[PDB]
Design a protein around this ligand. Structure first.
Ligand SMILES: C[N+](C)(C)CCO
Lengths: 70, 416, 129
């Protein structure tokens, strides 16, 4: 469905929620970040990359019990 | 011919108002001490909620058959049924005093839910049957009050009767004493309803009741071909369901904005229901004097929209006593509206049964409450409390205008 | 005021194989009674891996297949603390155990109908070796 979340992890720090419900931005997240759903395909986009955007981004499915991260 | 009132009208209204109080106590008893019942039974807070949510789900379907029995069988039959079910629900809850007997308490609470379908929309039928002009709107409010006072008492009695001890054997003893009290009052109110609830006084108490006396789906078609009753169904639903969504999410709001103030969140809920008991009475005491049913309905409604805005924009001013005042004013106005809405429905559709009108109003309020509660919990978790609160303000502002297009078509008044 | 939400993971320490350790997650700003808590683990040479989830409201506990039968998720609502008991730890259970919270407040009308919840707040982590 639209149960996809995009997390950002910088080294030695916890993952931070960027986008949830496929496209919904979480409060506080820079507006450059935006997510799209297209069937079982999900795309995160940083509109303008920034000194901050360098990190690891993980997709997650929360649709079923065994939560699976990308 | 002869329009005379008897003194048994009070007796009947008081016996109904009292077992409506008992039914409303049964609806909330499990919640008042939810964490105690979660431990006693080993179930979730979800499972204990189903107890309170079952009252609301049963009413929407069983309304149409219950309102048919009203006209097919009478008002004594409906009273005996409702009282008997309230008594049966209560006694079945004494084969539930073992941690592993949650199915049986739910069996009890379902029976207690079915009893409500024979109680909640009946105030206006009893007013019409037993009370004459200049007192019909007040019996209806004495009943709504009986219900609100049972919800209040029910917030206060279970924490006193049952302590938060974890011992599975002494907690069962502490729930036995509540279940016995309620069973023994539901039995007493039942046996009286069989003694003193006449199907009709000897003479009609009013000139409108005298003339009312002189297909079910046809009559349901005719109430929905009436625009002033359609508007009232929609607007009553908006107001009462916003009240429901306000009350369900009130605790959550005060803990978000006053973290550590759980005692005072429950106190704020008691203030809503106590202020509401007073407004229920006075709205009715004001209508049987003035007969101002379209203007009262609009001013109250508009006072439920001003109040939701002030509550909305004062929840984060950091003042807990302000939240007391605001929530108490809402409950005042939003509970005074309910008896007013029932009686305005009986004025707009006079010859039509009061049962069908009040039940359709209740079904609306229960549908809109479920919808607004689902919608609001989704808006708050994703946009904040102020947005979910504005949501309720915009459906109250929309309902204000809808209330204003309802005509002052006062038929029961025209029939005197 | 709206107290800020913080999740604090404690307990993580080196333990011998077949060792049992109990991590904790203190919760401030919200109540474990209205929200489900998840455990996610990251090994120094791996990525994020979901361990377990508990709902106090729905009374539900869910576990990752590898952890199942060795890990129990539990919650003390009276302390606003959740926990994880890892009974038979393997050398591949060495990781940074992070405790997160779901965005959804749990109540009778709670649903995933428009917005599917996600893991809103996360703890710093506590390492188990
Ligand atoms: C209105 N309640 C559901 C609270 C009780 C009716 O008996």
């Amino acid at each position: 469905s639209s149960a996809v979340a995009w997390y950002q992890q910088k080294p030695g720090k916890a993952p931070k929620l960027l986008i949830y419900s496929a496209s919904s931005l979480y409060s506080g997240v820079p507006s450059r970040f935006s997510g799209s759903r297209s069937g079982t395909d999900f795309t995160l986009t940083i509109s303008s990359l920034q000194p901050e955007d360098f990190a690891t981004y993980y997709c997650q499915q929360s649709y079923v019990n065994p939560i699976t991260f990308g | 011919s002869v329009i005379k009132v008897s003194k048994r009208r009070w007796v009947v209204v008081l016996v109904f108002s009292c077992y409506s109080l008992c039914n409303a106590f049964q609806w909330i008893q499990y919640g008042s001490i939810n964490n105690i019942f979660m431990n006693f039974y080993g179930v979730s807070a979800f499972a204990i909620d189903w107890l309170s949510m079952c009252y609301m789900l049963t009413y929407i379907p069983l309304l149409l058959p219950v309102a048919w029995m009203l006209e097919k069988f009478g008002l004594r039959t409906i009273a005996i049924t409702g009282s008997a079910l309230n008594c049966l629900g209560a006694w079945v809850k004494l084969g539930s005093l073992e941690p592993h007997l949650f199915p049986v308490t739910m069996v009890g609470q379902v029976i207690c839910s079915v009893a409500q379908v024979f109680i909640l929309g009946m105030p206006s039928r009893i007013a019409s049957v037993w009370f004459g002009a200049d007192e019909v709107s007040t019996a209806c409010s004495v009943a709504v009050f009986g219900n609100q006072l049972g919800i209040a008492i029910g917030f206060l009695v279970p924490p006193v009767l049952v302590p938060n001890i974890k011992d599975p054997e002494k907690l069962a003893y502490h729930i036995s004493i509540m279940f016995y009290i309620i069973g023994g009052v539901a039995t007493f109110l039942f046996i009286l309803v069989i003694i003193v609830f006449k199907e009709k006084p000897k003479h009609p108490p009013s000139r409108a009741q005298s003339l009312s006396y002189a297909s079910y789906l046809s009559s349901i078609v005719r109430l929905f071909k009436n625009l002033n009753f359609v508007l009232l169904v929609i607007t009553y639903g908006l107001n009462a369901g916003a009240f429901y969504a306000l009350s369900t999410l009130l605790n959550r709001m005060v803990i978000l904005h006053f973290p550590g103030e759980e005692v005072n969140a429950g106190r704020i809920g008691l203030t809503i229901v106590i202020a509401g008991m007073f407004g229920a009475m006075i709205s009715g005491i004001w209508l049987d004097k003035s007969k101002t049913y379209k203007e009262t309905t609009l001013v109250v409604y508009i006072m439920t929209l001003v109040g939701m805005v002030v509550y909305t924009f004062t929840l984060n001013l950091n003042h807990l006593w302000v939240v007391f005042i605001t929530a108490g004013t809402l409950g005042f106005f939003m509970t005074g509206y309910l008896p007013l809405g029932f009686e305005f429905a009986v004025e707009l559709t006079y010859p039509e049964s009061e049962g069908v009108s009040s039940g359709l109003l209740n079904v609306s309020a229960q549908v809109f409450g479920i919808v607004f509660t689902i919608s609001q919990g989704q808006i708050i978790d994703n946009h904040g409390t102020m947005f979910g609160n504005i949501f309720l303000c915009v459906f109250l502002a929309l309902g204000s205008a809808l209330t204003a297009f309802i005509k002052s078509d006062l038929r029961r008044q025209r029939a005197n | 005021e709206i107290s800020e939400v913080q999740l604090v993971e404690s307990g993580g320490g080196l333990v011998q194989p077949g060792g049992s350790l109990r991590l904790s997650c203190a919760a401030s700003g919200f109540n474990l009674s209205s929200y489900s808590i998840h455990w996610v683990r990251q090994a120094p040479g791996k990525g994020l891996e979901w361990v377990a989830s508990i709902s106090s409201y729905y009374g539900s506990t869910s576990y990752a297949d590898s952890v199942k039968g060795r890990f129990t998720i539990s919650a003390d609502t009276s302390k606003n603390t959740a926990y994880l008991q890892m009974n038979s730890l393997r050398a591949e259970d060495t990781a940074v155990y992070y405790c997160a919270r779901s965005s959804r407040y749990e109540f009778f009308y709670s649903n995933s109908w428009w917005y599917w919840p996600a893991m809103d707040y996360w703890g710093q982590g506590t390492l188990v070796t």
